[PDB]
Amino acid sequence: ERENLKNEATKVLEHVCEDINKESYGFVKISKMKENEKEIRLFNLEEIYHSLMHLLQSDIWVRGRIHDIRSKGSLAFIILRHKLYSMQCILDIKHNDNDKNMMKWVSNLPLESIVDIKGKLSKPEVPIDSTNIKYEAHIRKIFCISKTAKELPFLLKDANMKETNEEGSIKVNQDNRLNNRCVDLRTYANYSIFCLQSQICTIFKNFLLENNFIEIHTPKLLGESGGANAFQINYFNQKGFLAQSPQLYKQMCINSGFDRVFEVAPVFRAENSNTYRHLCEYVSLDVEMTYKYDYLENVHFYDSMFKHIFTELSKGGKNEMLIKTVKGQYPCEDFQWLEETPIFTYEEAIKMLIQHGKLHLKEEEILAYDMSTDMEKELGKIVKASHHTDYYIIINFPSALRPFYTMYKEDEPAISNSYDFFMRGEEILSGSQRISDVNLLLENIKRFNLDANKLNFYIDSFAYSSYPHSGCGIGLERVLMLFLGLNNIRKTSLFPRDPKRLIP
Amino acid sequence: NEATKVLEHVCEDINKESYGFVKISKMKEEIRLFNLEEIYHSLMHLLQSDIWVRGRIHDIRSKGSLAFIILRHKLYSMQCILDIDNDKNMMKWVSNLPLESIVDIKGKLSKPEVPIDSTNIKYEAHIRKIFCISKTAKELPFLLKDANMKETNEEGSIKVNQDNRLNNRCVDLRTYANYSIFCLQSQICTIFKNFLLENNFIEIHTPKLLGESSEGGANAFQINYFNQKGFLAQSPQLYKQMCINSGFDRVFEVAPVFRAENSNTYRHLCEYVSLDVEMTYKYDYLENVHFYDSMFKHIFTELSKGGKNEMLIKTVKGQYPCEDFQWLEETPIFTYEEAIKMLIQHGKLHLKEEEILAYDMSTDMEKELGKIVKASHHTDYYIIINFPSALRPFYTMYKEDEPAISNSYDFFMRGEEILSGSQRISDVNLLLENIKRFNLDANKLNFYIDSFAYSSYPHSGCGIGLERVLMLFLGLNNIRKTSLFPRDPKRLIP
Ligand SMILES: Nc1nc(Cl)nc2c1ncn2[C@@H]1O[C@H](COS(=O)(=O)N[C@H](O)[C@@H](N)CC(=O)O)[C@@H](O)[C@H]1O
Numbered sequence A: 001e002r003e004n005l006k007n008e009a010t011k012v013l014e015h016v017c018e019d020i021n022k023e024s025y026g027f028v029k030i031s032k033m034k035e036n037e038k039e040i041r042l043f044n045l046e047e048i049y050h051s052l053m054h055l056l057q058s059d060i061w062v063r064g065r066i067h068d069i070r071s072k073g074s075l076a077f078i079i080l081r082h083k084l085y086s087m088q089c090i091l092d093i094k095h096n097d098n099d100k101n102m103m104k105w106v107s108n109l110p111l112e113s114i115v116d117i118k119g120k121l122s123k124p125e126v127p128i129d130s131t132n133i134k135y136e137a138h139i140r141k142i143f144c145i146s147k148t149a150k151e152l153p154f155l156l157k158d159a160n161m162k163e164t165n166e167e168g169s170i171k172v173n174q175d176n177r178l179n180n181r182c183v184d185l186r187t188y189a190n191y192s193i194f195c196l197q198s199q200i201c202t203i204f205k206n207f208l209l210e211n212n213f214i215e216i217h218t219p220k221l222l223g224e225s226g227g228a229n230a231f232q233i234n235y236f237n238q239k240g241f242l243a244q245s246p247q248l249y250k251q252m253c254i255n256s257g258f259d260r261v262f263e264v265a266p267v268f269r270a271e272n273s274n275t276y277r278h279l280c281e282y283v284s285l286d287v288e289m290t291y292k293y294d295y296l297e298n299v300h301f302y303d304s305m306f307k308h309i310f311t312e313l314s315k316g317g318k319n320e321m322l323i324k325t326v327k328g329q330y331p332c333e334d335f336q337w338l339e340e341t342p343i344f345t346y347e348e349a350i351k352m353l354i355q356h357g358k359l360h361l362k363e364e365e366i367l368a369y370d371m372s373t374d375m376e377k378e379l380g381k382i383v384k385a386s387h388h389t390d391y392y393i394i395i396n397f398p399s400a401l402r403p404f405y406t407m408y409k410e411d412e413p414a415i416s417n418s419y420d421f422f423m424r425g426e427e428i429l430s431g432s433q434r435i436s437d438v439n440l441l442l443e444n445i446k447r448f449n450l451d452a453n454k455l456n457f458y459i460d461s462f463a464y465s466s467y468p469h470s471g472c473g474i475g476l477e478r479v480l481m482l483f484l485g486l487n488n489i490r491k492t493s494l495f496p497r498d499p500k501r502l503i504p
Numbered sequence B: 001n002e003a004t005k006v007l008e009h010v011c012e013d014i015n016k017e018s019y020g021f022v023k024i025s026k027m028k029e030e031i032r033l034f035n036l037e038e039i040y041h042s043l044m045h046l047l048q049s050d051i052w053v054r055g056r057i058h059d060i061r062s063k064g065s066l067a068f069i070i071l072r073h074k075l076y077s078m079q080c081i082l083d084i085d086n087d088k089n090m091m092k093w094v095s096n097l098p099l100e101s102i103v104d105i106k107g108k109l110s111k112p113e114v115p116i117d118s119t120n121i122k123y124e125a126h127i128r129k130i131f132c133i134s135k136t137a138k139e140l141p142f143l144l145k146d147a148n149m150k151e152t153n154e155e156g157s158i159k160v161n162q163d164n165r166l167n168n169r170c171v172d173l174r175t176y177a178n179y180s181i182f183c184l185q186s187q188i189c190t191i192f193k194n195f196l197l198e199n200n201f202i203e204i205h206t207p208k209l210l211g212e213s214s215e216g217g218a219n220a221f222q223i224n225y226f227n228q229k230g231f232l233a234q235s236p237q238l239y240k241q242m243c244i245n246s247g248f249d250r251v252f253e254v255a256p257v258f259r260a261e262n263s264n265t266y267r268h269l270c271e272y273v274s275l276d277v278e279m280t281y282k283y284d285y286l287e288n289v290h291f292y293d294s295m296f297k298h299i300f301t302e303l304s305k306g307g308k309n310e311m312l313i314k315t316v317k318g319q320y321p322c323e324d325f326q327w328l329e330e331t332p333i334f335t336y337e338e339a340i341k342m343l344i345q346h347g348k349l350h351l352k353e354e355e356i357l358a359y360d361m362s363t364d365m366e367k368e369l370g371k372i373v374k375a376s377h378h379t380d381y382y383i384i385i386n387f388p389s390a391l392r393p394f395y396t397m398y399k400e401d402e403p404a405i406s407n408s409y410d411f412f413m414r415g416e417e418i419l420s421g422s423q424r425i426s427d428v429n430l431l432l433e434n435i436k437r438f439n440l441d442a443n444k445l446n447f448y449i450d451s452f453a454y455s456s457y458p459h460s461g462c463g464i465g466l467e468r469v470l471m472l473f474l475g476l477n478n479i480r481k482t483s484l485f486p487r488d489p490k491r492l493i494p
């Protein structure tokens, strides 16, 4: 009937190993991975890469995901992957007792399955280009502790590929990647992107901690309020909102005597506007601090904070490899900055734009001009050409274009003591000297047609004195996207939220 | 009006007046300004001349032609003395400065004969000049002197209500203990992050706007997300597992979570900062448990060392006394069954053997176990493992040869839960089985389930209450003392 032959070969493909002491292959439960009633010294590819670029003397155990597997008759080639490390492993069954069933079982493993391999490492004449570990494991044993259960939504070979203008080049589009984000995050570049994101949080916090800041956590469930862009929730039959920013609370912390504070936390913004550059939820980096007599003391401090961030991102083996891996798939010129950061007034920036023919305004209607986002990018091109930098500062915005807490110039009330920082022509930071006089604050709140009653907890925090202070807010994802030159904010947010995407 | 003009005197030139309210712009000669933290750290050499120093007027007293000002900044105070010069108009202006005003004082530093017991800067300043850059506009809601005192529960004594403090949090936070508490909160965050980063973790940030609850829809806040039905995250549980499923191997998050518990208790809030860890293990999830244990031991060690942290803990204990937090060199680990049998042996519970795994230990019972283990093991810190499967969430992996027990754990400080975690189910078929066994909607969770379907590493994780860890470390009586602007069902403001 020739059916028994198929059922037997199926038992081979599904083989469960009951004793890794007496067998060389199979699916195995984690609790059975004991060799001689003892525990296995198990390596990952990261350790292997550091030591090699003792475990060359004899057989070792190594764990990883099956990135790729190529069957070639009596040979089979496995690429193992861990993070951004990979290594070719070789099963040569003319070297394993002509166990053809073991080869049948190995060839049948689906991509991404997790295996523990026992084998010998050695260096080959011509190492594989794709693998950054230049040794190979010769497989003595291979057991699968987790088998892929389902066809992948797309192949990693395709998702890892640079921009495709070539014949037969398959792209994986944004919607597909984000709907299958846990597969998309396995590309080398995406892995590197979020290691770099972590790296920015780390450098940010450590710089501020070294300058005597304390970290704060302030609430995101608010009771009142730019109400236009605020998500609403029912807070126990009370009318509540999600924080668009920790603004009010970080200031209240300075009014309490904390002197220097920072927060790393989500904020929530209901901008019904699908763009490549904003999200409805993002991680905000917030700083608030006192100054002595000049708010430029703090500006120059914020500036050296970003020069330190850029310097650390661009220094050392680890950060060098992460950036290179991103650039392999998403090429872009290295981010440039100067020893002295260029600073331009809003008024100077306009005149540069009028002078380069990018902007036309009647000599009356200059103060009221609200520079567009496209125009800010035109300004960046100009400053890149004339100052050879991707990073500069704009100060002294018109008070009418800034929020109500922004201190204006005493002797020129239409100008404010405010500032934006730019990376590749796009805003990464916004801040200002604060109004720290209760009566001025009350006046400016009235002058903005705002309800002082819904702000009195905040207003009242200024009524028992208030140090001179300033602050800024920073988009983490935006800093990472613009440092690397990526085309979309969704590339630097783990599970992006926009007005059409609530899932994953 | 003549005496009023002198009390409201605005100084238009600092070089030649010596007193008055002055704007920040009219303050150049620019001075070299000091704060009391720089003073304190350099003394406990600027003592050779007149220095400028800014601070708040913590206390002021007019001993005839003498004026005593206690200047305050953060945790540091120093006594400053005015004794006219014979410029009586200046003594009038100073004596009327309301408390909490911010002044720039210029003068000389001298060792005092009798060091003031109150000021931890055991020097004094002699005032050559004093200006007020910020004048208290309003009468405080209570006095800092009363806010700083230990609460004597007797008739007619001072007591600043919790409600009064929280309604006026920006004054409340100026007490020496409250400032110290939140410095210690930053310290925990720092020790936690740095320990993980040194162990090769990466920081992740995952969304708090969801289409489905992460810890059960009964206690989740509802949100209108552009005409979708949404919820606030109760924990990053689903996303931190997805990141392990994506290969990140070791992740942590420090981020708010939101829980709509309609109970007003002393130990829980509706918003708190969750410290979350998720990581792979090789063969045995106890590898990660021991690692979590060693993280907390490191935190306790670093919090308890000499220097700044001892000063901070000491400042807190001055107003809120409590014995130092203790832990052993080797942490005690009890199974859930053993913990229950300790409670039975001490007459706190009457349970037959076959009823033990069905008992769900209450908060009071856990405090009772805390007292038992404190008397017998001499520690404030222990671990319980092997909780009943039916009492833990659906992502908890059960013991294969003993399914009614799970591979789960809580950590405790002073008998109260600070951490909860478990080995995760890392098999997509077993996960679907457990989702159904817990009568849950696999369709709502599909994005999460699916992340296990292209292989899943053995992993575990845990979630930690930042505010509760600080509260229990210091022995404080209410979670609202370790959250800056606490949220409970009755308080949305500040
Ligand atoms: N929808 C968004 N999506 C993404 Cl991804 N990033 C966004 C979005 N919106 C903003 N950012 C980023 O956050 C930055 C700060 O925000 S802000 O509005 O300009 N001013 C602050 O709130 C203000 N309180 C700061 C202060 O004065 O201390 C900004 O520079 C961008 O980089």
Ligand SMILES: Nc1nc(Cl)nc2c1ncn2[C@@H]1O[C@H](COS(=O)(=O)N[C@H](O)[C@@H](N)CC(=O)O)[C@@H](O)[C@H]1O
Binding pocket: B215, B234, B235, B237, B259, B261, B267, B268, B269, B270, B271, B272, B274, B417, B418, B419, B420, B421, B422, B461, B462, B463, B464, B465, B467, B468, B479
């Ligand atoms: N209302 C509250 N207020 C305040 Cl202030 N703190 C609270 C509140 N609720 C809880 N905590 C604290 O957070 C801890 C973890 O929370 S959890 O529910 O037990 N388990 C996790 O969610 C689970 N996904 C973790 C995992 O398996 O990795 C807990 O130990 C407490 O310390």
